[PDB]
Amino acid sequence: DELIKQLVMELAENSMIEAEGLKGTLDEATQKIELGFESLSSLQVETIQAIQATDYADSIKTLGENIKILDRSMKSMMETMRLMMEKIDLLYAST
Amino acid sequence: DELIKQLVMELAENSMIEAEGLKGTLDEATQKIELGFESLSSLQVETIQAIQATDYADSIKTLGENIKILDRSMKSMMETMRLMMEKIDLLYASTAIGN
Amino acid sequence: DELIKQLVMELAENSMIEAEGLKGTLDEATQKIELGFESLSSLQVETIQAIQATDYADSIKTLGENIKILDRSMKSMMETMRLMMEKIDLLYASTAI
Amino acid sequence: IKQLVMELAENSMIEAEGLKGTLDEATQKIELGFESLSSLQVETIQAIQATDYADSIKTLGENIKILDRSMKSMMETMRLMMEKIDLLYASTAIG
């Protein structure tokens, strides 16, 4: 009666202490989950933005353009060297 | 007594409020986790796809071919210039020593 | 009365219903956190490998090695052109009018 | 009865520490996921930021432009060489 009254009031004290404990921890876990996904998402966007920045499709276009220019300069040199070879042959023949 | 019945009825009522309060907070936490992993996982998949579909390799190949072609031509031009030097040498020796 | 018996037998049986409800959800949640980070870790490793396999530093390397060879042919031609001009100038002393 | 209640208090004490232990374990499995994945993301970003080669390709473009200038200047030197050969030829019996 007085012992059963102690038991029940003990249950209600210990239950609500435990219920609080578990509540407080869940809130901490919820803060943890919110911040953790906020950071993973931020770094995932930085990854995409860093890959975006590393674009060098334009570097390659420009390099290919200077190679074609050197190619055209080389073809003129070869033409010039054919004409020079002929003037050498002429001079030697004409000595 | 009516005391123990009132203590139990109060205990029972509060226990179910705390339990349903815990249950809902755990479901909200589980829902958040699921949506967290779901959303990040979608964007990482699309990140891998888009990396895989880049093709600079094709372009670096072409440039390497075009440089091999320039290299072959320059070896050809070095041969022409050796012959040109030999013909100049023959002109020099033959006019100097002959004449 | 059996009204103290009933109310408690009810609170005992459904508070155990609740507790298993929580234990079961907490055991799902845990399993999901594990399979979650396993999934993102694996995708992140696959990201790093997708990047590594589109790293062409070595292909650019070879490109640069091959441009160094053109440079060395150009150096060789420029030296031959220097010697040639000197031999042509020497013709001005040896070639009769 | 005193027993109906006393068993409840114990079964509820143990279910409770049963729960707090799986929770604190989840709370830590979560700190380790975020710490682990986040540093793996930092790696990834750092392995993109070490992998930029727009400058590498620009440098090769510059090497090509230097070769083009030497090629064009050799062509102007050989056109002088041709003028020198023509003058010599102009001076022979035949030219």
Numbering used by the authors:
A (entry chain B): 72 to 166
B (entry chain A): 72 to 170
C (entry chain D): 72 to 168
D (entry chain C): 75 to 169
Sentences from the paper on this structure:
It self-associates in oligomers through a central oligomerisation domain (POD) and bridges the RdRp and the nucleocapsid. Here, we used X-ray diffusion and diffraction experiments to provide a complete structural analysis of BoDV-1 P. We observed that P possesses a modular architecture, consisting of a central oligomerisation domain (POD) surrounded by two disordered regions, similar to other Mononegavirales Ps. Using X-ray diffusion and diffraction experiments, we revealed that BoDV-1 P adopts a long coiled-coil α-helical structure split into two parts by an original β-strand twist motif, which is highly conserved across the members of whole Orthobornavirus genus and may regulate viral replication.
Crystals were obtained for the POD of munia bornavirus 1 (MuBV-1; 77% sequence identity with BoDV-1) and Gaboon viper virus 1 (GaVV-1; 41 and 43% sequence identity with BoDV-1 and MuBV-1, respectively). The structure of MuBV-1 POD was solved by molecular replacement using BoDV-1 POD as a starting model, whereas GaVV-1 POD was obtained de novo using Se-Met derivative crystals. For both MuBV-1 and GaVV-1, the asymmetric units contained a tetrameric POD, whereas the tetramer for BoDV-1 could be obtained after applying the inherent symmetry operations of the tetragonal space group. MuBV-1 and GaVV-1 POD presented similar architectures composed of two α-helical coiled-coils (the monomers being parallel) linked by a kink. Globally, the only differences concern the relative spatial position of the two coiled-coils, due to the inherent flexibility induced by such a break and the crystal packing. MuBV-1 and GaVV-1 breaks were also composed of three residues, with a strictly conserved aspartate in the middle. The Ramachandran analysis showed that all of them fall into the β-area, with neighbouring residues at intermediate positions; this confirms that this specificity is conserved in all Orthobornavirus P. Using the Vc determination on the diffusion data, the MW were estimated between 40 and 45 kDa, 12–16% lower than the theoretical values, all corresponding to tetramers. The three X-ray structures fit perfectly with the SAXS data.
